[PDB]
Amino acid sequence: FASVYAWNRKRISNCVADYSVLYNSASFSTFKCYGVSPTKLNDLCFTNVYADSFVIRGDEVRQIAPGQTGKIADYNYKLPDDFTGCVIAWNSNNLDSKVGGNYNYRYRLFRKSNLKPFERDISTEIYQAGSTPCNGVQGFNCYFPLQSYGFQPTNGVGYQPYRVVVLSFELLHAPATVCGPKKSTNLVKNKCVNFNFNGLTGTGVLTESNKKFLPFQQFGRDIADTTDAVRDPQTLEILDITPCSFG
Amino acid sequence: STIEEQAKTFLDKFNHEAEDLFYQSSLASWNYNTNITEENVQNMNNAGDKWSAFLKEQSTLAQMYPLQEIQNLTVKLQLQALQQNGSSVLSEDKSKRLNTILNTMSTIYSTGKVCNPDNPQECLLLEPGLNEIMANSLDYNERLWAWESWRSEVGKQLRPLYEEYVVLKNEMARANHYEDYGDYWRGDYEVNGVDGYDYSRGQLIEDVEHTFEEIKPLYEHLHAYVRAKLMNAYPSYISPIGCLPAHLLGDMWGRFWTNLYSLTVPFGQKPNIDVTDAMVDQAWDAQRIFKEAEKFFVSVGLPNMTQGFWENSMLTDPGNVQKAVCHPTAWDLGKGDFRILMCTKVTMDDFLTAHHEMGHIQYDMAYAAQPFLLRNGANEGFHEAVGEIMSLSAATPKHLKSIGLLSPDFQEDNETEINFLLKQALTIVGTLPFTYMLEKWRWMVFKGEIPKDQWMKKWWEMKREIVGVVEPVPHDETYCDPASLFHVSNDYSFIRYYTRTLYQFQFQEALCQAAKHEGPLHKCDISNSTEAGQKLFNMLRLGKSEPWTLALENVVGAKNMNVRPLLNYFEPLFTWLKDQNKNSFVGWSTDWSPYA
Ligand SMILES: *[C@@H]1O[C@H](CO)[C@@H](O[C@@H]2O[C@H](CO)[C@@H](O)[C@H](O)[C@H]2NC(C)=O)[C@H](O)[C@H]1NC(C)=O
């Protein structure tokens, strides 16, 4: 993954995201979020999801929290308190740690100001911690805004590399485009049933039909939105609906 | 910008850039002390030289900060140790002279060898051999000759070297804003911060004898008991008005009186609690012993261990040529790595030592939440006292019966409990006069009250007067007795154990009082006592983040020194001593001497 001060942000659209694997996999050490109930991810449908993946230190996962102070939360990646999404943090010691001392992933430590919600700043400038300009030189009261991680093979929980990806579900004026599928049951015939064919609802009894839909229509009707023929969204066949008997 | 923010930024940079370096140094030291190899030699060399070389610049930055206005008491607390001059204000000549003097003292102390006049081609060293032969001998002549040989082929040359070291270190203190080296040593038990919790540097000087004088009845009764045993022993050597000699102290210096157990047996027939044979009959492996100790620690309430300690560290029987020195230690490597170093064996002494080292581990993890600069206790007395609390708590018969070791039908009576109390006191309270007089001698020599000529005469005079140990043969000025010691020739503080005994007994009594236990304190078990564990957790977790007097506020409600727990523990023993030697009178005469 990316560094915490340069977290990899990707915009995701028009993908049928099955969050069931996310909901069930134990590979994710952290699945702790509040924006959406974890069981309703498939049903709720959004647009232009933002996946921000990075590698941090183990103890920094609590830094990722709305209205929370810290080091990487206020200097590397700030979360607005109106988060609608989730955070996935999992231990990856064998993935991003080295026996000789891993120092690849750096983290911002000193910043002149705070960070805006969902703001990414890649500024690499000398820090003026005193009353004299540092001129890009580490003099008196002059330090480095970034520091390095200390991943070691014998490091326990809290120091090992943690891979964290945050998913932000934004619902703006554009039509929603990212969400999972709906389970399709087995088809029955010749029985008074009720159905939800591809979003078109109705109660009746279905039979095999011989009508020839022209290759782009979906369903047919006779008079005043009284649907008579439908096409199954799976096998591409034409059935017809008649009402359940009464009198 | 304000100076406090600059100091905080300096701390944020320095702790981060020093954590990795000290972690590497600890890794190298542990690797050598576990995987002994020639490569590990230069491993520690090149991982420990960098520590000092980097701390050089770390202290170099800590001079531009005016450490007289930083507030909140937190930045100042760390920066005071960071802004420590120590031995960095010298010229090359004096510094190299001090280094050479320490080197020659160490070499002479570590080269100790004694050969008899008849055969000078086979000497024996301070390692077992001479030591075991003389400390557990049967005749007087070999003990006297061994004492003379050690005092005449080790400490004879060290008089001028010790004098030069003492004066040079006093000059070090004077150039480093201290009147004495003893003042620097006493600066540990002192805080200059919060009002009402302050302790002065000169307070300890009076307080040591203030808390030492109350054991004078117990010490004198034990001394009279030992004297009566000696008179009943080999005669024409002990007088009813004198005291016990110097070479019959059970040791070289009389520092520890554990080996005098057999000669001063009150009952003798009744044995102590020792079911090591029951353990080996149960065929317990060392992991079972460690698991039982962990179960006791969890029953107390101390936090659980993290995984990795039981894996990366060696546990038992290293075996083949890849040897491992196993001095009992609880290695605080840090950065999610904490280990132990021990030759764990199935024996009660090893069981108590494992409890001691696991208690040291628990204390070290207690202040682990502190930053790098403050991952240690407020004073040197808390560490070993915490270590020995769970050593004292694992000796009660009830715990041994509860771990399925003692017999279910093993009942406790007066005789065995009294014997256990007496044997515990033989080592615990049998060293305080010697420690007090040694610290007094060091304070006097660093202050300079006594002149160069009146060093050893005064030492032996206050040994006869306070401790009660006499001159076997006369030595005036050509034998340097204190330099023939580990803590005097290695520059290690000895008040650490003096405060450690008081701390451990105070904490033992505190947990026993707040553990819902009634009866003798020697049978008090802190196992399955959640309130005692809560108290110990709430206290030990602070570390050095709080002053020692402020630290002396949670386990015991008293911030002052009280010797009362020491007498509280050994109350039945003193009560029996009040009637055993009801004929011989306690005390001794200084004018009496073996030769005079
Ligand atoms: C939807 O996926 C199913 C699963 O493969 C497809 O069903 C297969 O279709 C082929 C082609 O007729 C058959 O040979 C297989 O026997 C079918 N497998 C089954 C029913 O398990 C189906 O064709 C796909 N339909 C669409 C529109 O994509």
The full DSSP string for B68-84 is TS--TTTHHHHHHHHT-
Q: Could you give the angle at the alpha carbon of B576 between the alpha carbons of B575 and B580, nearest 5°?
A: 130
**Cα separation of A172 and B534, whole Å?**
52
Please answer whether residues B410 and B397 qualify as being in contact, where contact means their C-beta atoms are separated by less than 8 angstroms: yes
Q: Is B458 annotated as a binding residue?
A: no
Ligand 1 cavity residues, CB under 6 Å:
A 234, 236
Chain centre distance of CA B118 = 39
* CB-CB neighbours of B268 under 10 Å: 10
Q: How many CA atoms lie within 13 A of B455 on its CB side?
A: 21
Q: Is B157 exposed, middle or buried (0-12, 13-18, 19+ CB in 10 A)?
A: middle
**Cα separation of B312 and B295, whole Å?**
21
**Cα separation of B510 and B249, whole Å?**
33
**Chain B contact for A110, CB < 8 A?**
yes
Name the strand (E) or helix (H) holding B460.
helix B456-462
Please answer whether residues A46 and A179 qualify as being in contact, where contact means their C-beta atoms are separated by less than 8 angstroms: yes
**Cα separation of B207 and B592, whole Å?**
30
Residues in CB range of B307: below 8 A, 6 or more apart: A156
Catalytic residue among B4, B487, B531, B553: B487
Residue with tokens 């070389």: B53
What's A148's DSSP letter? E
**Chain B contact for A2, CB < 8 A?**
no
Residue with tokens 């450490």: B67
Ligand 1 center to residue A216 CA distance, Å?
20
Per-residue DSSP letters for B279-340? HHHHT--HHHHHHHHHHHHHHHTPPPPPTTHHHHS--S---SSS------EEE---SS--EE
Residue B9 with chain A: CB contacts under 8 Å? 110, 127, 129, 141, 143
What's B124's DSSP letter? B
**Chain A contact for B6, CB < 8 A?**
yes
**Cα separation of A233 and B583, whole Å?**
111
Are the Cβ atoms of A157 and B23 closer than 8 angstroms? no
Active site residue B127: no
CA B576, B579, B584, B587 dihedral sign is: positive
Long-range contacts of B488-493 (CB under 8 A, 24+ apart): B488/B162, B488/B438, B488/B442, B489/B105, B489/B106, B489/B108, B489/B109, B489/B158, B490/B106, B490/B109, B491/B102, B493/B185, B493/B188, B493/B380
Beta strands in A41-160 (DSSP E): 47-57, 85-91, 106-108, 127-128, 142-143, 146-148
Residues in CB range of B491: below 8 A, 6 or more apart: B102
SS3 content of chain A, % helix, strand, coil (to 5): 5, 30, 60
**Cα separation of B141 and B123, whole Å?**
18
**Cα separation of B386 and B554, whole Å?**
14
- Report the structure determination method: cryo-EM
C-alpha pair distances (Å), A56 with each of A65, A148, A153, B366, B411: 14, 10, 16, 26, 59
Resolution (A): 3.3
* CB-CB neighbours of A41 under 10 Å: 22
Q: Is B221 annotated as a binding residue?
A: no
**Cα separation of B357 and B363, whole Å?**
10
**Cα separation of B200 and B503, whole Å?**
19
* CB-CB neighbours of B61 under 10 Å: 16
Nearest to B498 by CA among B272, B157, B188: B188
* CB-CB neighbours of B510 under 10 Å: 21
Ligand 1 center to residue A39 CA distance, Å?
29
CA B337, B343, B348, B353 dihedral sign is: negative
Q: Could you give the angle at the alpha carbon of B13 between the alpha carbons of B10 and B17, nearest 5°?
A: 135
**Cα separation of A1 and A57, whole Å?**
13
Q: After which residues is chain B broken (C to N over 2.5 A)?
A: none
End-to-end C-alpha distance for chain A, whole angstroms:
67
CA-closest residue to ligand 1 atom 24: A234
Cα R_g (chain A), whole angstroms: 27
Q: How far is A70 from chain B (nearest CA, A)?
A: 14
Long-range contacts of A170-177 (CB under 8 A, 24+ apart): A170/A46, A170/A47, A170/A48, A170/A49, A170/A50, A170/A84, A171/A46, A171/A47, A171/A84, A172/A47, A172/A48, A174/A47, A174/A48, A175/A47, A176/A45, A176/A46, A176/A47, A177/A13, A177/A14, A177/A45, A177/A46, A177/A47, A177/A48
Helices (H), chain A: 20-24, 72-75
CA-closest residue to ligand 1 atom 3: A234
Nearest to B59 by CA among B85, B78, B77: B85
Facing A150 at nearest CB: one of B9, B307, B335: B335
Residue with tokens 């005789």: B415
Tokens of B442: 């060091």
Residues in CB range of B232: below 8 A, 6 or more apart: none
**Cα separation of B371 and B11, whole Å?**
10
**Cα separation of B390 and B178, whole Å?**
38
Q: Is B151 annotated as a binding residue?
A: yes
Please answer whether residues B250 and B260 qualify as being in contact, where contact means their C-beta atoms are separated by less than 8 angstroms: yes
Q: How many CA atoms lie within 13 A of B244 on its CB side?
A: 27
Tokens of B388: 């020995």
**Cα separation of B86 and B52, whole Å?**
13
- For residue B399, what are the β-bridge partners? none
**Cα separation of A71 and A110, whole Å?**
9
Name the strand (E) or helix (H) holding A118.
none
Please answer whether residues A146 and A124 qualify as being in contact, where contact means their C-beta atoms are separated by less than 8 angstroms: yes
Residue type, B51: W
Q: Directed axis angle between helix B203-212 and helix B432-447, to 10°?
A: 160
- For residue B204, what are the β-bridge partners? none
Nearest to B470 by CA among B359, B589, B324: B589
Please answer whether residues B491 and B172 qualify as being in contact, where contact means their C-beta atoms are separated by less than 8 angstroms: no
Residue type, B288: R
- For residue A78, what are the β-bridge partners? A117
**Cα separation of A143 and A137, whole Å?**
9
Phi-psi domain of B306 (left: phi exceeds 0; alpha: psi -120 through 50; beta: other) = beta
* CB-CB neighbours of B101 under 10 Å: 20
Query: Which three-class secondary structure state does DSSP give residue B547?
Result: coil
Instruction: Tell me the best of A235, A236, A237 to mutate to test the pocket of ligand 1, counting ligand atoms within 8 Å of each CB and taking the most.
Output: A235
Please answer whether residues B342 and B328 qualify as being in contact, where contact means their C-beta atoms are separated by less than 8 angstroms: yes
Please answer whether residues B25 and B48 qualify as being in contact, where contact means their C-beta atoms are separated by less than 8 angstroms: yes
**Chain A contact for B9, CB < 8 A?**
yes
CA-closest residue to ligand 1 atom 18: A235
Closest residue in A to B24 (Cα–Cα): A101
Tokens of B389: 């609390």
**Cα separation of B475 and B478, whole Å?**
7
Please answer whether residues B429 and B566 qualify as being in contact, where contact means their C-beta atoms are separated by less than 8 angstroms: yes
Helices (H), B35-120: 38-61, 75-82, 92-110
Residue with tokens 């003692």: B406
Residue with tokens 């034990």: B222
CA-closest residue to ligand 1 atom 23: A235
Residue A28 has φ and ψ, to the nearest 5°, of -85, 110
C-alpha pair distances (Å), B155 with each of A219, B106, B226, B473: 110, 12, 29, 16
Ligand 1 center to residue A20 CA distance, Å?
23
**Cα separation of B473 and B273, whole Å?**
41
Tokens of B489: 């020739």
Q: Is B12 exposed, middle or buried (0-12, 13-18, 19+ CB in 10 A)?
A: middle
Q: Which residues of B201-214 are buried (b: 16+ CB within 10 A; e: fewer)?
A: bebbbeebeebbee
Q: Which residues of B344-370 are buried (b: 16+ CB within 10 A; e: fewer)?
A: bbbebebbbbbbbbbbbbbbbbbbeeb
Cα R_g (chain B), whole angstroms: 25
Nearest to A5 by CA among A50, A56, A67, A51: A56
Please answer whether residues B442 and B495 qualify as being in contact, where contact means their C-beta atoms are separated by less than 8 angstroms: no
Query: Which three-class secondary structure state does DSSP give residue A12?
Result: strand
Q: How far is A8 from chain B (nearest CA, A)?
A: 26
**Cα separation of B194 and B555, whole Å?**
20
Residue with tokens 């039909």: A209
**Cα separation of B90 and A32, whole Å?**
58
Say what the alpha-carbon torsion angle B24, B29, B31, B35 is, to the nearest 10 degrees.
160
Closest residue in A to B9 (Cα–Cα): A129
Say what the alpha-carbon torsion angle B26, B28, B29, B30 is, to the nearest 10 degrees.
80
Active site residue B4: no
Facing A141 at nearest CB: one of B6, B16, B23: B6
Tokens of B160: 């001028």
**Cα separation of A120 and A201, whole Å?**
46
**Cα separation of B520 and B421, whole Å?**
10
Q: Is B496 annotated as a binding residue?
A: no
B1, B5, B310, best to mutate vs chain A, most A CBs in 10 Å: B1
What's B89's DSSP letter? S
Are the Cβ atoms of B23 and A160 closer than 8 angstroms? no
Tokens of B423: 């044997």
Tokens of B52: 């000092």
Ligand 1 nearest atom to the CA of residue A233, by list position: 27
Tokens of B519: 């009866």
